Amino acid sequence: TEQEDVLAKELEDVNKWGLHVFRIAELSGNRPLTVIMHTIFQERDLLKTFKIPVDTLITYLMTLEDHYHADVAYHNNIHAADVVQSTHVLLSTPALEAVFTDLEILAAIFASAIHDVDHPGVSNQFLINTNSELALMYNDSSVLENHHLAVGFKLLQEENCDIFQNLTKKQRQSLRKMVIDIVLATDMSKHMNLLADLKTMVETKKVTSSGVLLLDNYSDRIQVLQNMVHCADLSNPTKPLQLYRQWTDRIMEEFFRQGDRERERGMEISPMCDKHNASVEKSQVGFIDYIVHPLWETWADLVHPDAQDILDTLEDNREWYQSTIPQ
Amino acid sequence: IPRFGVKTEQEDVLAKELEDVNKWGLHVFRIAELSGNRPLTVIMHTIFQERDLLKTFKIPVDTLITYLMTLEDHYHADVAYHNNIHAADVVQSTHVLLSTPALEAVFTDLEILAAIFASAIHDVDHPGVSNQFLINTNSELALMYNDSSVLENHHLAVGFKLLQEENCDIFQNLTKKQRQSLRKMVIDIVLATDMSKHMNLLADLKTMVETKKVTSSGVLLLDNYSDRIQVLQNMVHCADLSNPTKPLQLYRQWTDRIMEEFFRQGDRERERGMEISPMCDKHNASVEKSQVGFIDYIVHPLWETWADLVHPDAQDILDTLEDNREWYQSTIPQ
Amino acid sequence: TEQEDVLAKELEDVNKWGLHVFRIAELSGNRPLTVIMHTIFQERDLLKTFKIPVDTLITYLMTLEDHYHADVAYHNNIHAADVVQSTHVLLSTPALEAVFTDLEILAAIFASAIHDVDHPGVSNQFLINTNSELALMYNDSSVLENHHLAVGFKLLQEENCDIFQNLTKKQRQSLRKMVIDIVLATDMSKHMNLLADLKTMVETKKVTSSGVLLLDNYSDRIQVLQNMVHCADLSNPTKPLQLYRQWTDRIMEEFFRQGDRERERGMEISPMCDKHNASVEKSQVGFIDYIVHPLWETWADLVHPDAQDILDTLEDNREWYQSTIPQ
Amino acid sequence: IPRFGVKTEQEDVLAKELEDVNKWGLHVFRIAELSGNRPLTVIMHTIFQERDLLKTFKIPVDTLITYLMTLEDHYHADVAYHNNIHAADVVQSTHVLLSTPALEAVFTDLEILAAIFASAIHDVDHPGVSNQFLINTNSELALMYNDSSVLENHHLAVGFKLLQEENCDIFQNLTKKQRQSLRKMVIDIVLATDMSKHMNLLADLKTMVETKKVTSSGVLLLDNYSDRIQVLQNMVHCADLSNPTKPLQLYRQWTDRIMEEFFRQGDRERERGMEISPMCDKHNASVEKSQVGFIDYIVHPLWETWADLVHPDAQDILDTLEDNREWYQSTIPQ
């Protein structure tokens, strides 16, 4: 338990943006998703609130984690633990204090933990082009996203894995719809139109008598939740450079692997996947310029301005990569 | 099925019925009976031969026939409305719509193949119950498709999967380019049959009619994929919603069937202590009032707009719809 | 009311070989499996014993019944209800009194209930020959049987359908193995081996202090349960002629329908499936002589003299059909 | 297009290594490195070319290579033993056994293709855990296969399913009769790889040896499908269990890998609070003693019997097995 102290201390940062997730992954014996999720649940007192037997929770978490591919560079259990922990911080954003119910909170966190489960390390288009069984089952539409959801729920059926066994029928139905709405929203093909609404919304932004954001209908409450987890999934560039660079190393490794596979198959190599003609630095700045920043700028507003330290970090990291661009 | 190389008595009657394949109002139920319950197979085959689709896409005839029978075999005979007769009707209706003057020479053979194939598979393996029923019972289908367009996704998955059975790949001779294109259009069209897409689908159709463009010929102008697929989606959607525009004799048979299917679902919901879906309670129904509402809020608005787009091609269809609307209206007991 | 009293009265014969199962099918609005299963569960006190909530039982039964095809002439919910009821009678045979446990009883009945669920009305060979998805999934081996089991168990996951939610893990563990063993044995491909082994047991027939049969190991126990359900699945010829004749009209219609489909596809028409070259009477006599009678004669030996009247009804029916053979 | 189905600049070193493809003891680990982790693709391609299977069954070369890369891609790189290297090894081992003098000209080209294909797909998509683990956790796989030869059934289903991916149908030019016969043999062979069937397989192999028949040539006489398929099943079974009969240098690497996989399952079982499977507890292991036992109760009885069937073809293989058995014996801590 010598390191049990290190892990324990490391976890003390679970509420902080910039947790040493990679260290935790090492300290936990490659169980970042299980320990982090377990801490967040204990912390938010979700086990007692939803009467979740401790053994059941841990068995499901290990099972869920086990279904993330250890051989995949980016989309693995570490990325999952990261999006969970990040959504967890984004939920505690002052501008949302006491806004969401324990169920909505449970939904956001659960959705984050399962959002990429059983990811093969290749894109939807690659699965589509090859006529993979997954693309055939989902009609080439949000192939992976649909799959992530199905697996996430199916695993609840394994031995002692149903963590929602004590929710009421109504709670289960409401939880399930939200989890689905959120995960399906992680598909980058939804990003554009998804962003517009986050804007159109921040325009009419309303506050309560408590100074916290005001959300009425399901429509508005889910959009915030959708964009929120969507931000957590696209939060690598807003973290301290040290962590961010590791994520970039990982995503590039996954990209290049796909490119090697497309190349050996005589398939057109996907954008940014050709290791023989790459622009890692230039791609990061462009990624930040046309996608991440535009998204994270709006959320910075929405939770005005508890996201400041986060937005400045994004801009700082951009400059860094910018100064790394060859020629 | 023949003898000595000549059609049998039945076959000849059937062939004579099939002569109206290019006409709105085909005696589809008569064809279903005459063909030994193979309306989808015979109608699809007639249309493929009519449009020379076998040669154009090099589809071996035995493969086409084997796939068709296999596809038809996966529609449920015990389902009153959503069966092979409904599929054959939608195929034939789409076929007629494709040949409307306002669209002559607008679509490629591939887009034509896509609209017809999508129509043929659009409701395959339909269980006779709504998406919400599948969602409420936590069915495996709903679990697989995340409660989103459960049936429509299933219809597509099954339509394509059946291509893998013995000698069923009718697209074996298409290039990967053709197949990727064909597949995307078919998927776009069938997913658009989910009623949850009706409103937006109609909105865009209206918008298009607003900015409508033609050429030296009174033929519509469609540039991008977005407008071409929009028209194809609304075309098959209209076909799927064409029952009220057919001669009253046919329209009523369809109403009897959808009502039977609705009531059957209602009885299942009642057995299960579930809330009975709208119009599915045989004990508290208003068949006539419901057909009137169906026309006033859904069918007429859709077809009216379509008639604008292909004006004046759909005039008669529109007038028939209005005649049938009045008929049902006058049937409402007070 | 009336039709309700008629149904209630008909169900009174639930413990008798020769129940008017078709009449019950009509009277219940096509719910023979639901009403007969429910009746039998009450009769054996299974709801109390395994604490099965009544709403859960009814919902599961209707769900299971709904997954049998109404358009299938023979392999539909009436056949299922019939096998369930037939197994229920065989279980009460004197020579087996107090031999099986409540769990083993439950397994045999549940197995009977789900043994042909979602049957498409065509043989394994037809499915194999057309390269169907089911055959590909099950490697052409007991395709339908494996499928009936997978569906039967899967349906327990639908809303309020888990009738074993109160069984212990050990009970679930044992019940599942027994159900699997029983249904896989319904494949006619395993008939010959089943009969042989059954006979062997008839030779090593070990009685008990109470004069009832003696079964030590799981192997002998499951063997008797497998043959029992097998006999039930093959009991049509041993039932009152009015019933038997209906069964024959149904199986023949299913056979002929497959034969037409095979004819359509240019496939070789399966044995007895060609309506243009049929011999219904002749075929039934052959079915009794080479399969049904051999099996039952043996079962009669094991439970002597418990099934004398069943055996006599068979031999009687055999003659009826024989004399029906035109010349 | 590449010489070995895979691009490589070390092509020279790789080509040299592949010269021993017909030899027991090929340096498969070296080939995996030289091929860029494509041992299965490279070895299968080499064997197919060598046995002239591409021409004999009109298998397009790009199709073969795409299928192989696809098949190989579905073996898990994170699994220490049951991965693409094990697959490549069993394929190559079966290839050698098929060429043994006592079996010359006995099997048809189709049976040869079946044995080799079966060897290639026999452990595809293996999760690194046993059937029992999948059963006790109520996995979807066990549910689908009713807890019977769960993995073996899945390996077959995936191996065949993958033929449906883009340009992956290597059997597209086989007549219907050939496909049916090939499919049956492959299924019979892979299902026989389940250890639960080992004892019965051995017993039948022994019986065959006891009534062994040879033709006018010096080769084994196999009259019926039953005897033919039995020999092929045991052949692939021996290949799957051939690690202890390979040069010690290779055998120890295989041992390190299976032990790594065993212990990982052990840690997972421990985590979940499950009883730890035999030899899976890294805290109470006896690696050396376990290998001797494995050889004494399973591997040697099997190979001793196979050696009798093909006497004296496998004499050196048996000699190696025995030498290796002694090495581990002396490695046992006293």
Ligand SMILES: [O-][n+]1cccc(C[C@H](c2ccc(OC(F)F)c(OC3CC3)c2)c2ncc(C(O)(C(F)(F)F)C(F)(F)F)s2)c1
């Ligand atoms: O598939 N997927 C879904 C959600 C999130 C991610 C993260 C994934 C991702 C994550 C971290 C990251 O770098 C860093 F943050 F670690 C990335 O760098 C690259 C060059 C865009 C990319 C992508 N987001 C958008 C991607 C696109 O390829 C493009 F770059 F925008 F073009 C896509 F949008 F898909 F077209 S890929 C990947």
Ligand SMILES: [O-][n+]1cccc(C[C@H](c2ccc(OC(F)F)c(OC3CC3)c2)c2ncc(C(O)(C(F)(F)F)C(F)(F)F)s2)c1
């Ligand atoms: O499931 N589905 C998809 C596409 C088309 C159809 C035809 C289906 C249909 C077809 C023929 C028909 O009557 C006649 F034309 F046969 C119908 O009568 C009823 C009362 C609407 C309904 C429906 N269209 C819209 C339906 C709705 O339930 C409602 F009535 F409009 F509310 C829905 F829109 F779904 F809410 S159901 C059914």
Ligand SMILES: [O-][n+]1cccc(C[C@H](c2ccc(OC(F)F)c(OC3CC3)c2)c2ncc(C(O)(C(F)(F)F)C(F)(F)F)s2)c1
């Ligand atoms: O699929 N299946 C599994 C178990 C039991 C049944 C009942 C099924 C059955 C049931 C009732 C019946 O008649 C009557 F009892 F209703 C039957 O008539 C025929 C000609 C044998 C057949 C069969 N049992 C054995 C059948 C065989 O075709 C043969 F006759 F033995 F050759 C088979 F064994 F399959 F080869 S088919 C059907």
Ligand SMILES: [O-][n+]1cccc(C[C@H](c2ccc(OC(F)F)c(OC3CC3)c2)c2ncc(C(O)(C(F)(F)F)C(F)(F)F)s2)c1
């Ligand atoms: O799952 N599976 C199927 C076929 C072949 C293998 C190879 C697998 C195998 C392969 C190489 C090997 O060692 C070496 F050759 F690499 C092994 O070491 C161990 C302790 C038996 C085991 C097994 N064969 C039999 C195994 C058993 O656990 C037991 F040892 F016999 F008890 C089993 F039979 F399963 F009970 S596991 C594994």
Ligand SMILES: [Mg+2]
């Ligand atoms: Mg994702």
Ligand SMILES: [Mg+2]
């Ligand atoms: Mg539909």
Ligand SMILES: [Mg+2]
């Ligand atoms: Mg059966």
Ligand SMILES: [Mg+2]
């Ligand atoms: Mg194996």
Ligand SMILES: [Zn+2]
């Ligand atoms: Zn993600």
Ligand SMILES: [Zn+2]
């Ligand atoms: Zn429809």
Ligand SMILES: [Zn+2]
């Ligand atoms: Zn049966």
Ligand SMILES: [Zn+2]
């Ligand atoms: Zn193996």
